[PDB]
Amino acid sequence: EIQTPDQAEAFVAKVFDVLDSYDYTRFGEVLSTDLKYEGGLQKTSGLDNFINDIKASTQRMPGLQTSHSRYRTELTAEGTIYSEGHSNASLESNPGKVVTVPMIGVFKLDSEDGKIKEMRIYKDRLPFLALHQ
Amino acid sequence: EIQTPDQAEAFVAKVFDVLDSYDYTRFGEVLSTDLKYEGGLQKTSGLDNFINDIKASTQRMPGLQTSHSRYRTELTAEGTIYSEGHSNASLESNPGKVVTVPMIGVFKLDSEDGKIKEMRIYKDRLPFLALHQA
Ligand SMILES: CC(C)C1=C(C(=O)O)[C@](C)(C[C@H]2[C@H]([C@@H](C)C=O)CC[C@H]2C)C=C1
Ligand SMILES: CC(C)C1=C(C(=O)O)[C@](C)(C[C@H]2[C@H]([C@@H](C)C=O)CC[C@H]2C)C=C1
């Protein structure tokens, strides 16, 4: 399935395309039922727990929009995907105010179906405070 | 010379041993003079610029103390070191208030002398605001 860095990067792109849509009914297309997720101090086990965690943060930030880009992905001999890129966010209240930070995603895939079973996203959230005027 | 993940991880531990001492005269033992560093929106080119960036940031937080641990390191076929661990910080004024966040370091080494020529550190700094409060 995923054999090259380019295919890994395209998969990560597809994953964030789903995630940034906030269409939770599709998250299971790409995330395993027992997903282990860490995002700084946010940590969840299982797909429903992942979805509930995002929903909570999203109610906290109404009007939130996010997007992601990638520029450097490796696919290692252990099967790990390391993907460096950037994370963008804006608030619908002032959508022209965009905050962008570097990010890296660490992914391990399910050997059976190729879904993400471990996802650890690293980025500095402090700059997103600038979304509040 | 680094050929295994365990040696990669042991080297990263020593690197942060030097960095967390804030003894800037030693940074060149492990960092190349043309080091390319990115730490969130912090970005520097050259060792002197890296050092000045840290010095500026430390002036903002007197009494800062830091340490690091590691748990999962890979050394790839491209020579890249990816090292996941944690970043701890406290203030000397209140040393028992510790804030710890996950972190990962991305490193490329100088083929000549084995020093770090690229270092990109990723972590959420927002929790460290709790070091001002109480
Ligand atoms: C302030 C930032 C921009 C923020 C996110 C975060 O930093 O946790 C969340 C809580 C979740 C992100 C997800 C995680 C897995 C990020 O990669 C994917 C996209 C978005 C739903 C949404 C906005
Ligand atoms: C608030 C946080 C904890 C903080 C750091 C940071 O987040 O930039 C700096 C500015 C620099 C770090 C260095 C960079 C390369 C971090 O990895 C190494 C250790 C410390 C000297 C010091 C404390």
Side-chain angles (χ1 to χ4, degrees):
Chain A
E1 178 51 51
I2 292 150
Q3 305 179 356
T4 73
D6 279 352
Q7 298 160 314
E9 187 162 284
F11 180 65
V12 174
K14 168 180 154 85
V15 169
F16 280 108
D17 286 344
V18 175
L19 294 179
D20 289 323
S21 75
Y22 294 88
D23 182 1
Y24 307 107
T25 69
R26 299 191 57 209
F27 279 18
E29 295 173 20
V30 291
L31 311 177
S32 301
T33 60
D34 49 356
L35 170 72
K36 302 285 297 143
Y37 163 71
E38 194 166 38
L41 296 182
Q42 307 304 120
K43 189 175 176 192
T44 59
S45 193
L47 176 57
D48 282 328
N49 291 320
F50 180 78
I51 289 167
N52 287 336
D53 214 73
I54 304 303
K55 275 175 174 176
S57 310
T58 258
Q59 308 316 119
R60 187 163 300 263
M61 280 175 290
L64 172 80
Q65 296 181 101
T66 54
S67 64
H68 292 79
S69 55
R70 297 131 298 275
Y71 65 95
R72 202 194 177 276
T73 301
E74 291 194 34
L75 172 66
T76 76
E78 324 195 1
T80 315
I81 301 171
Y82 294 100
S83 192
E84 294 182 275
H86 292 83
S87 169
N88 318 295
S90 65
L91 290 177
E92 207 162 344
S93 55
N94 40 334
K97 181 59 187 179
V98 173
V99 172
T100 297
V101 304
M103 61 81 61
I104 183 178
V106 185
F107 313 82
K108 295 229 147 243
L109 284 45
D110 193 314
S111 54
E112 311 188 292
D113 61 15
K115 298 194 185 74
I116 296 162
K117 63 160 153 168
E118 303 174 24
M119 170 164 77
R120 299 185 291 276
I121 306 300
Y122 297 85
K123 64 175 179 280
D124 192 0
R125 297 187 176 101
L126 188 54
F128 291 110
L129 294 187
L131 291 178
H132 301 84
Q133 308 175 183
Chain B
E1 178 217 74
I2 294 148
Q3 302 185 357
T4 73
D6 283 353
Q7 296 163 313
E9 185 163 285
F11 178 62
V12 175
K14 287 209 174 270
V15 169
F16 281 112
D17 283 342
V18 173
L19 295 183
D20 287 322
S21 73
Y22 295 89
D23 184 2
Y24 308 107
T25 67
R26 300 192 58 207
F27 280 17
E29 294 175 25
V30 292
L31 310 178
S32 308
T33 56
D34 50 356
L35 169 73
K36 307 285 222 337
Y37 164 69
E38 196 174 39
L41 296 181
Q42 307 303 120
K43 191 166 177 189
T44 57
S45 196
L47 177 59
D48 287 326
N49 290 317
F50 177 78
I51 290 168
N52 288 338
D53 211 272
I54 305 305
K55 273 175 175 177
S57 310
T58 48
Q59 298 310 120
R60 189 157 54 264
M61 280 180 188
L64 173 81
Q65 307 176 108
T66 53
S67 67
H68 290 77
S69 59
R70 293 132 299 276
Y71 67 95
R72 200 194 177 275
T73 303
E74 290 194 34
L75 172 66
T76 76
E78 324 197 1
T80 316
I81 298 171
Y82 294 95
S83 190
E84 294 177 275
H86 293 81
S87 178
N88 317 294
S90 67
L91 292 178
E92 254 161 33
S93 56
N94 187 14
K97 179 58 189 178
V98 175
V99 171
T100 298
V101 304
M103 63 82 62
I104 182 178
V106 186
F107 313 82
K108 295 289 229 176
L109 288 215
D110 192 313
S111 55
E112 313 185 290
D113 61 17
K115 298 192 185 175
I116 297 162
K117 61 153 157 170
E118 302 175 25
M119 171 164 76
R120 297 186 292 278
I121 307 299
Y122 296 83
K123 63 174 177 281
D124 193 3
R125 297 188 178 103
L126 188 54
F128 293 115
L129 294 187
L131 292 181
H132 297 157
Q133 312 170 12

